[model samples]
Target: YFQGTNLIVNYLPQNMTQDELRSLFSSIGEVESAKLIRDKVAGHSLGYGFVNYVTAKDAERAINTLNGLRLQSKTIKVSYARPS
Candidate 1:
């Protein structure tokens, strides 16, 4: 699976913070970046985000341990991202 070192997180908590999200992935390895989406005009969260890792191995290490897991009172789904 030599696609890439990125992850797509589906349906995150609306109130999830960048720092909390960043720290969540950082637990697996050094996080390249963790971004939460938002509605620019509405000024509210879109309840989804993306996470990046330095290596695909590190990214894969996160799948089972982090997938379908609860965080900030919400369960999140994790899957590899194919850059678009």
Candidate 2:
């Protein structure tokens, strides 16, 4: 089945937060959820996040629009997410 609605964004800035992730992705389309992976002990972001869109078309558009974007000296990578 098609399961491309979820995306993985990598190389995020160290200061990037969950709310920012959601807001950035939501600019393209309706985002189901956006979560920044964090360290339990340190409570710091892991430099990556998961973004789930309401539709696969919008998800792909996100990758096309945002991938390799330079943000605060960091080039973010966006792609279809794989199972953990």
Candidate 3:
């Protein structure tokens, strides 16, 4: 029953923080959670993350505006997470 309430971000900045990411999304709408996956080697960011908004509308807005948004000199891709 996941109606696209979650957005997946790729090519994230290696140095971006979970809170910073959350804050960025918060600027557009209410964010339920934001997280950055880390590597087991050095706890460095894996250049990807997940953001869940309280509503599908917020998620759509995030995807619309965040897709192709540049962060740390790299453009990010925002899309609904594929089932895995």
Q: Say which candidate scores most in TM-score.
A: 2
Q: lDDT per residue, candidate 1, 8-79, as tens digits? A: 888788888778788889999988989988898987888888999998888898886799988667889998
Q: What Cα-based lDDT does every candidate model obtain?
A: 0.85, 0.93, 0.87
Pick by TM-score: 2 or 3, better one: 2
**Segments of candidate 1 deviating more than 4 angstroms:** 1-3
Q: Name the lDDT value of residue 67 in candidate 1.
A: 93
- My TM-score estimates for the predictions, one after another, are 0.86, 0.92, 0.89
- Expressed as tens digits, the lDDT of each residue in 1-84 for candidate 2 is 445899999999999989999999999999999999999899989999999999999998999999999989899999999876
Q: Give candidate 3 misplaced runs (Cα > 4 Å).
A: 1-3
Query: How close to the true structure is residue 48 of candidate 1, measured as C-alpha lDDT?
Result: 82
Report clashes for each candidate as comma-separated counts: 0, 0, 0
Using TM-score, rank the candidates from best to worst: 2, 3, 1
